[PDB]
Ligand binder design. Structure first.
Ligand SMILES: [Zn+2]
Lengths: 50, 248, 93, 106, 69, 93
RNA sequence: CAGAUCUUGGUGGAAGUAGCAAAUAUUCAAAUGAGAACUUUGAAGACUGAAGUGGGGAAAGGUUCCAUGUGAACAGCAGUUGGACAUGGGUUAGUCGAUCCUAAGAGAUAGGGAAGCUCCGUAUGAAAGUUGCACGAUUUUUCGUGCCUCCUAUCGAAAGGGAAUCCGGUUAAUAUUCCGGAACCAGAAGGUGGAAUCAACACGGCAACGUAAAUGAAGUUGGAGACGUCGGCGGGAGCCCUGGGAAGAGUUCUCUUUUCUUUUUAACAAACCAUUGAACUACCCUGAAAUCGGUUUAUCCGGAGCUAGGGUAUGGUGUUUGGAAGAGUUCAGCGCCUCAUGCUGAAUCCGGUGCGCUCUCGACGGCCCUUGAAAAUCCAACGGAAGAAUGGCCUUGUUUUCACAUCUGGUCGUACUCAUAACCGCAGCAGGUCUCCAAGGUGAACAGCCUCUAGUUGAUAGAACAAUGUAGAUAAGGGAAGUCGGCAAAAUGGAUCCGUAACUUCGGGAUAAGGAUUGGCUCUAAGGGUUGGACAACCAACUUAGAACUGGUACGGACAAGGGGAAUCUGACUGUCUAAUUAAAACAUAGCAUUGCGAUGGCCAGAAAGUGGUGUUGACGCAAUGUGAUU
């Protein structure tokens, strides 16, 4: 609400960083089948729950 | 069944509302000055205590042992005016507003804020318009018989203190409340006991009087004295019941 | 104009609460909202505040009196004052 | 006409959210948050406000000079002139009464 | 901002060490404002006479930095 | 339209939606009338046309709604002054 | 395995079917593009109509904010577009909050219970200790002791209390934070300087009291913080309205010296402050008042000292200035690839008004068996601890509660939505979610209706009006004959003037019932404010009443907006409940009555407790019941 604690802001920063597209080279690694990921979170679909 | 409202009144929600109250109305600590002579204080404030029908008197006293002024919270007697002098002790004059030992007062005197025991700092006759009458004295094993507002006779040690006069506030119960709002405002600053729902208007799970196709108690409302909580409702240990026309 | 045959101050209550209750309240409020004389200043300026406190204004005698619910002095208190005065005189003499 | 908004994140009309309309040198009508009004010190014996002392918040009195917070008199800035005079007369008369009481005792 | 009306007081406050810069402002009503930038306050003197303004400028400390806006 | 209303147009019974009190309070009208009457009474008293006693009587009468307007008050003052002068000249002999 | 309304998964007929219809509404042209009903631009027509579809916030969300690209999936139609996808960027504080304090409360510690998880308990039955002086010390200074005295854990509010910032400009996205200018607060140390001292720590006023300073340790006291609600009155700021001048724009068959936009002065600082607007508001001096006087819209004041005269204080959202025109705004020219966007010109002026709106202040009045927080912190007083110049002249102690000057002010939040798409409801759901500002006209009005600023034109579209529907209307004659039942609809409705019954608790009923009028135009009369030699030249105001004339015999012309009356049953009334079938005669209520209890107590609680509530209480009280106004 624009009035957030330091812990809340750090958690939001962590959530934002864990939302980026996956680089393709890691998926192309031999023996690595990361490929597509359903871990992607949208602000309007799945809430963080603090 | 279910726990009744009487059992639920053990605290919590049903605690007294004491935010706006100005302090306890204890007389004073029985010290050497009050035990051997008197001490003169000056009343400086007369204030209204919410939840109490009688005004309270803020009275300033000089500390005998320290350079300091002590303020008390006397229960104001009728005729008390700010700036007057009150005297507390054995040798105090028999004047309205003065605090004297009960045993040092003449028989038949009218007092207020009387102590049940020495040093109790006021127990009897504290409500507005109420007072205690000194019935008699008994020097041998010094005890004073007094008459309480309820009409009972109580024996107290002949060293308990009392305030000469009648508690201020007059007869407050002589005016009809006339409105549920007036009753609501009266009890709001006292506690959560209003309004009250009748037991016969309840269900059997709620009250012993609840249930039935008609609103009726079903059994006698006079219950024995040694009733368990939850069934001690109605008229507890009623010696008599009904309208009485003439008795002592 | 008279504006009221008998209700007087209780005209604010309309027709509710009953005639006897309105009459009793009318007497009480007439006593309650009355200017009284300061026993130390001699001016008819004593007014009630919060059911037992009576104060009079002016440059002097700003005393606050502990009185009755709606009268400065009650009959019972006056009788008690006379009784205490009598007892004090007997003890002194 | 121009309509204004609160300049702070307090969105309620509380006693600490007093605002005044100002016209800036840009033809802009906007709010200006202001503090509560000060209070003149009151007499300790009668409760009347004390003459010659400004009305300020409690912390604002620390920045004033000494003579602006008092009156050049005994009990100045704590009691009114009438209260001081009454105390002086009452003190002198009662001390005289004590002296005559002792002399009459002797 | 503070306003001065005494020529000698303005000269003294100009000769004071904290006085750093002076500004000359000419208005359409034939008035000249001398504004001294001190550490805490900006001091303004208003002069209505150009004859007096010229002598004030001459008597001002030449070591002081004075600019015209 | 405002000019026409100032001249006295569009002010009929069919153009009024609020009550007379709502359109113009009688309390405000009485306040203005009392202030006008008291101002005139003070002006006359400080000018010397009337004395303190006549001023006090007229002040109480104005508070009692004796005079409908300034003209009525002036006529009442003129009659009172004429009678007072008549008594003063009669008592000379 | 064929079943178990079997389990998991996949897939059918229904079926290209139901449907994608609330919230007035879109149209033309151009650009882009392969593709345009949905993108952008322009024009037109509209809506929200200031209690908004506007501008901001609290909670909640967390990057949705901005720029550049994309149109695989979502945007139940589409898409060149998006709160979608991808890549980067974006939140700058001594002054805004948190942080500090305390409220309801939470909760350690001592101690006591409990097998124990843990419970009670917060100066409690605790050896519960931080503040104040110099005893010693080279010498002009916080450490070792000397006897102290009711100190005390902490957490708990982004709406309570509180030290301090404004203006203009700037970005694609940040502004009381950045830039420019101009200020303020707190803390730390300590260069002047006048005052006074050849001896003590200033003067003035008959007073209220005033000043550029004008020594002050403990201890104590007082004040501020610090407080309800309603009603009227007066003042100020902003807005609204209005008369001129100036600049620009609109209309111009005709008329309109016309219509529309701008004409601005922040924090802070100084001097006045009843003048120019507003107390006799408080207090003081002279004087002593009945033939009592003064005085408010409102009835209060005076031998406890009126009226009157003269003073003192309270002092800004008031006045004159600085800030500050150098800013901003409007208009008009020159460079013309113009570059760091440069340069040259003007105006920004003089007046008025108010039962007007919002906010605020001042003096008042009413109400309470309701009297409407605490603490941190700051100030003042009583009191006198302590101090050392003297060769009549250099030299030091106070004055840094005078003025000026130096340094420092850490950490966390700051983007954006705040909702018919950024929160919750499975969703871009007609639901729900606290609050700030509120223009003009009509009108009593924050009603309804139209309009200005601002915003939007977003709710899949096209064609045609079949039955039956949903919503809105009308209808000759009859007028409830319909139906269980006047269900529904109609009818009445604003304002002014007449008139108003039974009954009644005398207060009501009552807007009872029942009648008349209402437009426009031209006038008349009355009700108020400074004013030149009892007169009186204008300016600036809204009402009320009446008359004539006139038209569709019409006029609260849209909107807005009581149907009324006669009886019975029941509940006295206001109020409350079965969220999502029952709002009632049910519950509650004041009133009335009964019962218990004087503290070693009544009632309630707890496993126990050196345990809790009533109880900051004391029979005019607490607790437990029944009935339900008044008579
Ligand atoms: Zn008195």
């Amino acid at each position: 609400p624009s009035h957030k604690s330091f812990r809340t802001k750090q958690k939001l920063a962590k959530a934002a960083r864990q939302n980026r597209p996956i680089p393709q080279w890691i998926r192309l690694r031999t023996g690595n089948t990361v490929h597509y990921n359903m871990k992607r979170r949208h602000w309007r679909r799945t809430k963080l729950n603090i | 069944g279910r726990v009744i409202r009487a059992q639920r009144k053990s605290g919590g929600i049903f605690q007294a509302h004491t935010r706006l109250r100005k302090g306890a109305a204890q007389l004073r600590t029985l010290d050497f000055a009050e035990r051997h002579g008197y001490i003169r204080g000056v009343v400086q404030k007369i204030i209204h205590d919410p939840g109490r029908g009688a005004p309270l008197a803020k009275v300033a006293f000089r500390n005998p042992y320290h350079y300091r002024t002590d303020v008390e919270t006397f229960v104001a007697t009728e005729g008390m005016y700010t700036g007057q002098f009150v005297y507390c002790g054995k040798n105090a004059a028999l004047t309205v507003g003065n605090v004297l030992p009960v045993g040092e007062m003449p028989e038949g005197t009218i007092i207020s804020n009387v102590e049940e025991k020495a040093g109790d700092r006021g127990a009897l006759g504290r409500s507005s318009g109420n007072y205690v009458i000194i019935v008699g004295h008994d020097v041998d094993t010094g005890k004073t018989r007094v008459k309480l507002p309820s009409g009972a006779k109580k024996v107290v040690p002949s060293s308990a203190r009392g305030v000469v006069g009648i508690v201020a506030g007059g007869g407050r119960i002589d005016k009809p409340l006339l409105k549920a709002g007036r009753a609501f405002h009266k009890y709001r600053v006292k506690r959560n006991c209003w309004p009250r729902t009748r037991g016969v208007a309840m269900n059997p799970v709620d009250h012993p009087h609840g249930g039935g196709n008609h609103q009726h108690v079903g059994h006698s409302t006079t219950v024995p004295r040694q009733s368990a909580p939850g069934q001690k409702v109605g008229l507890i240990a009623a010696r008599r019941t009904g309208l009485l026309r003439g008795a002592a | 104009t008279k504006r009221t045959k008998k209700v007087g101050v209780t005209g604010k209550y309309g027709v509710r609460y009953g005639a006897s209750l309105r009459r009793d309240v009318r007497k009480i409020e007439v006593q309650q909202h009355s200017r009284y004389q300061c026993p130390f200043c001699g001016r008819n300026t004593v007014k009630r505040t919060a059911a037992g406190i009576w104060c009079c204004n002016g440059k002097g005698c700003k005393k606050v009196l502990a009185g009755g619910a709606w009268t400065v002095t009650t009959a019972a208190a006056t009788s008690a004052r006379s009784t205490i005065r009598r007892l004090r005189e007997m003890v002194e003499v | 006409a121009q309509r204004v908004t609160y300049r702070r994140r307090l969105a309620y009309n509380t006693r600490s959210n007093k605002t005044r309309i100002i016209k800036t040198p840009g033809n802009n009508i906007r709010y200006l948050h202001i503090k509560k009004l000060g209070t003149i010190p009151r007499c300790g014996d009668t409760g009347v406000p004390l003459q010659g002392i400004p009305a300020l918040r409690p912390r604002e009195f620390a920045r004033l000079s000494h003579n602006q917070k008092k009156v050049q008199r005994a009990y100045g800035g704590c009691l009114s002139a009438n209260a001081v005079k009454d105390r002086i007369v009452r003190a002198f008369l009662i001390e005289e009464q004590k002296i005559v009481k002792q002399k009459l005792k002797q | 901002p503070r306003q001065i009306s005494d020529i000698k007081q303005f000269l003294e406050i100009a000769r004071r060490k904290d006085a750093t810069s002076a500004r000359i402002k000419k208005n359409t009503n034939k008035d000249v404002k001398f504004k001294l930038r001190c550490s805490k306050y900006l001091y303004t003197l208003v002069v209505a006479d150009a004859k007096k303004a010229e002598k004030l400028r001459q008597s001002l400390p030449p070591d002081l930095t004075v600019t015209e806006v | 339209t405002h000019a026409a209303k100032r001249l006295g147009r569009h002010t009929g019974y069919g153009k009024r939606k609020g009550t007379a009190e709502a359109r113009m309070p009688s309390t405000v009208v009485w306040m203005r009338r009392q202030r006008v009457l008291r101002r005139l009474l003070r002006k006359y008293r400080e000018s010397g046309k009337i004395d303190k006693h006549l001023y006090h009587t007229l002040y109480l009468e104005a508070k009692g709604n004796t005079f409908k307007h300034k003209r009525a008050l002036i006529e009442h003052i003129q009659r009172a002054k004429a009678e007072a002068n008549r008594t003063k000249l009669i008592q000379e002999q």
